[PDB]
Amino acid sequence: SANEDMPVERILEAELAVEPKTETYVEANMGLNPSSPNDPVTNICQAADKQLFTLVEWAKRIPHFSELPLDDQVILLRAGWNELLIASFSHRSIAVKDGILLATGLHVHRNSAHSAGVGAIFDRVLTELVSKMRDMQMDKTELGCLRAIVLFNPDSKGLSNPAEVEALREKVYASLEAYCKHKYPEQPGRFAKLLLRLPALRSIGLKCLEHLFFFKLIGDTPIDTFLMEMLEAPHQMT
Amino acid sequence: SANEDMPVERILEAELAVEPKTETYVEANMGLNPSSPNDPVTNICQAADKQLFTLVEWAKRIPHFSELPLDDQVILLRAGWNELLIASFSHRSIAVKDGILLATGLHVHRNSAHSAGVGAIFDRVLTELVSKMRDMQMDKTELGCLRAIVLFNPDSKGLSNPAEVEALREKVYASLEAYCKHKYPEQPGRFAKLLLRLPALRSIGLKCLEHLFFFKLIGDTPIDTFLMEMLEAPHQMT
Numbered sequence A, B: 001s002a003n004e005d006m007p008v009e010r011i012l013e014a015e016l017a018v019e020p021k022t023e024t025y026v027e028a029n030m031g032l033n034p035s036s037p038n039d040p041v042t043n044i045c046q047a048a049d050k051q052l053f054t055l056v057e058w059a060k061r062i063p064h065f066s067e068l069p070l071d072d073q074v075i076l077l078r079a080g081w082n083e084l085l086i087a088s089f090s091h092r093s094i095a096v097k098d099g100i101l102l103a104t105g106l107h108v109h110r111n112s113a114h115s116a117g118v119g120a121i122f123d124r125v126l127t128e129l130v131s132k133m134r135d136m137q138m139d140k141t142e143l144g145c146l147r148a149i150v151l152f153n154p155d156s157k158g159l160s161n162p163a164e165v166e167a168l169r170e171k172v173y174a175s176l177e178a179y180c181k182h183k184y185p186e187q188p189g190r191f192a193k194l195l196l197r198l199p200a201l202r203s204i205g206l207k208c209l210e211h212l213f214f215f216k217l218i219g220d221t222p223i224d225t226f227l228m229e230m231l232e233a234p235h236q237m238t
């Protein structure tokens, strides 16, 4: 266990860098200061784009990640994006109840996901991840370290050097325990409690891929506001 | 962290109780001392039955499990059987190479699984679990504690008291760390390395359910030996 090879402060920085601005959260949910038009395709493409940025800007800021062969960096991001995205929108949603806050600042309510056909996956996110993170008062350093552990997956298919990725993973969890021990001495089993949210992240990630949850999650509100305009507009042709 | 509420010795006992006898391994693979006939249905039903016994006899021997409401005991076994079964046949296969040893003592070779249509799931078992367990020289106490952590899943749907199951889970991993620390002081990050095999167990378990891997794994050899007899028998009707 050591913090020099994997500083938790440098891991917290990576998480803070990609954190949405307060103005993003406010604008999205008030419909204010739109850059974007009421076109569903544009809005979906912009949301996907903002999510990709969050994952890539975060990863590059993780210690030693950019020292891996570029081929391995692509494989790790492509193999873990689903889980990385889920862990990120789960922790961001701790303050909110019955909903998810996306990288665009948008709040997707439980009800919208239930009418969208993704209700059960959404409830698994709320229950298995969001509630659990809120109860332990999981901090952004802990999230950061959980996400770097997901990132540094030595089991990803196609890696040139799996031993390097595995050595990088070990350092993250060695720093995570040192951090947990020093900040939460009253909680001796917190490190395990954190690592034990990863199997749920794994199953949820697979279930999201099978149901087009990412597509429906980012596509639902843009479809609603577009239809709202058409329904609110006056009578048309013939 | 404490061993009185969850003794690792009592957890090792549970694993040892359900461990196949040497005579089972020898008889299965030599075709010797058959109780069973060359009927595929009987052989599949007997294998499923032996696997169920292993899971139930193991669980009852786990400290405090039988003190949970009986309704919760059923839910925990039904929710985690797939993962419990996989962790069990993975560790049993450490000594063998390119194959899996079942509770019936039977050795299913990689090649048979490839011709059966389950090749990729089988290779994931060999690579993600079997190899990893063999490299760390994972002991039966460690396996036992990993399996009780899977057993005591507080996220299972329908539990009357999820807090009790979660409290039981915490004790297992508290004992597991104390064990790891005391037996492997040269390996300070072993406890994490062990807990980090659980997300792979989770994904593999889901993939096994979607491809009828348990059905095909136990059904393949009984179908082969039945067809072998028919093909080896002399010419028949008209």
Ligand SMILES: C[C@H](CCC(=O)NCCC[N+](C)(C)CCCS(=O)(=O)[O-])[C@H]1CC[C@H]2[C@@H]3[C@H](O)C[C@@H]4C[C@H](O)CC[C@]4(C)[C@H]3C[C@H](O)[C@]12C
Binding pocket: A022, A023, A026, A027, A030, A032
């Ligand atoms: C005070 C808090 C945040 C605290 C903070 O962190 N403050 C840094 C500077 C805040 N901003 C980044 C928004 C400045 C934008 C300058 S920009 O050049 O980008 O327009 C900010 C964040 C978003 C702001 C609201 C939204 O805007 C929507 C709306 C626009 C109207 O018109 C005026 C009213 C209203 C309700 C705003 C009030 C207030 O002010 C809010 C709540």
Ligand SMILES: C[C@H](CCC(=O)NCCC[N+](C)(C)CCCS(=O)(=O)[O-])[C@H]1CC[C@H]2[C@@H]3[C@H](O)C[C@@H]4C[C@H](O)CC[C@]4(C)[C@H]3C[C@H](O)[C@]12C
Binding pocket: A028, A029, A030, A031, A107, A221, A225
């Ligand atoms: C801000 C206003 C609501 C104001 C309001 O009506 N506020 C008082 C409520 C108080 N109550 C009567 C409930 C009593 C509370 C008692 S209690 O004790 O329970 O607190 C709400 C009502 C309809 C909302 C829009 C639509 O959705 C469509 C769209 C969805 C997107 O996603 C975000 C953008 C957008 C344009 C939304 C923006 C905004 O969000 C609107 C204007």
Ligand SMILES: C[C@H](CCC(=O)NCCC[N+](C)(C)CCCS(=O)(=O)[O-])[C@H]1CC[C@H]2[C@@H]3[C@H](O)C[C@@H]4C[C@H](O)CC[C@]4(C)[C@H]3C[C@H](O)[C@]12C
Binding pocket: A027, A028, A029, A030, A031, A032, A034, A035, A036, A037, A038, A043, A104, A105, A106, A221, A222, A225, A226
């Ligand atoms: C565009 C309309 C406003 C009504 C309208 O139809 N107004 C005319 C066009 C306005 N424009 C600014 C595009 C003009 C540009 C001219 S220019 O020549 O500069 O291109 C506004 C009002 C509510 C806005 C949505 C919500 O917030 C929720 C959500 C937040 C995400 O974060 C981005 C996606 C999404 C779906 C938002 C999209 C868009 O933002 C909406 C539909």
Ligand SMILES: C[C@H](CCC(=O)NCCC[N+](C)(C)CCCS(=O)(=O)[O-])[C@H]1CC[C@H]2[C@@H]3[C@H](O)C[C@@H]4C[C@H](O)CC[C@]4(C)[C@H]3C[C@H](O)[C@]12C
Binding pocket: A031, A225, A228, A229, A232
């Ligand atoms: C109909 C409601 C106002 C009614 C109200 O009081 N909202 C309180 C919340 C309670 N509900 C949502 C249940 C009310 C439903 C309608 S009810 O008839 O029940 O009141 C108003 C308030 C804000 C309005 C949107 C924004 O301008 C942005 C955007 C501009 C585009 O150019 C056209 C589309 C869009 C999405 C607009 C649609 C619609 O025009 C909204 C939702």
Ligand SMILES: C[C@H](CCC(=O)NCCC[N+](C)(C)CCCS(=O)(=O)[O-])[C@H]1CC[C@H]2[C@@H]3[C@H](O)C[C@@H]4C[C@H](O)CC[C@]4(C)[C@H]3C[C@H](O)[C@]12C
Binding pocket: B022, B023, B026, B027, B030, B032
């Ligand atoms: C010495 C080792 C295991 C060491 C051990 O743990 N020894 C405890 C007693 C062993 N058994 C449980 C098998 C006794 C069965 C008594 S029973 O009443 O169940 O038949 C035992 C385990 C299984 C035994 C083989 C198989 O049988 C198949 C075969 C049957 C023939 O005929 C004789 C040859 C052969 C190759 C056997 C030789 C030997 O002996 C083996 C390898």
Ligand SMILES: C[C@H](CCC(=O)NCCC[N+](C)(C)CCCS(=O)(=O)[O-])[C@H]1CC[C@H]2[C@@H]3[C@H](O)C[C@@H]4C[C@H](O)CC[C@]4(C)[C@H]3C[C@H](O)[C@]12C
Binding pocket: B028, B029, B030, B031, B107, B221, B225
């Ligand atoms: C024990 C004998 C093989 C003996 C043998 O032929 N032994 C010498 C090999 C030495 N070599 C020539 C390979 C050189 C090694 C050089 S090296 O340097 O590589 O070591 C093998 C050959 C065919 C096998 C059966 C069938 O499968 C069907 C069935 C499958 C079930 O699942 C288990 C039961 C059963 C009845 C099997 C039992 C047993 O298992 C048999 C009789």
Ligand SMILES: C[C@H](CCC(=O)NCCC[N+](C)(C)CCCS(=O)(=O)[O-])[C@H]1CC[C@H]2[C@@H]3[C@H](O)C[C@@H]4C[C@H](O)CC[C@]4(C)[C@H]3C[C@H](O)[C@]12C
Binding pocket: B027, B028, B029, B030, B031, B032, B034, B035, B036, B037, B038, B043, B104, B105, B106, B221, B222, B225, B226
């Ligand atoms: C039954 C045949 C032997 C040839 C035959 O067809 N022999 C006549 C019948 C013999 N019986 C003992 C059933 C008579 C009982 C009379 S009584 O009146 O008592 O019912 C034997 C030889 C090889 C044996 C398989 C392999 O090992 C692999 C595997 C191990 C598992 O662990 C159990 C399943 C499986 C598929 C085994 C089933 C069965 O075991 C086989 C086919």
Ligand SMILES: C[C@H](CCC(=O)NCCC[N+](C)(C)CCCS(=O)(=O)[O-])[C@H]1CC[C@H]2[C@@H]3[C@H](O)C[C@@H]4C[C@H](O)CC[C@]4(C)[C@H]3C[C@H](O)[C@]12C
Binding pocket: B031, B225, B228, B229, B232
């Ligand atoms: C054909 C082979 C022997 C040939 C040999 O030398 N085995 C070495 C291994 C190498 N191979 C598997 C590639 C050889 C394939 C056949 S080859 O023609 O290439 O030799 C022999 C050896 C043991 C025999 C089984 C047992 O009695 C149990 C059982 C009794 C039932 O009543 C009928 C079914 C069954 C499954 C029997 C089938 C078959 O009769 C086996 C596999």
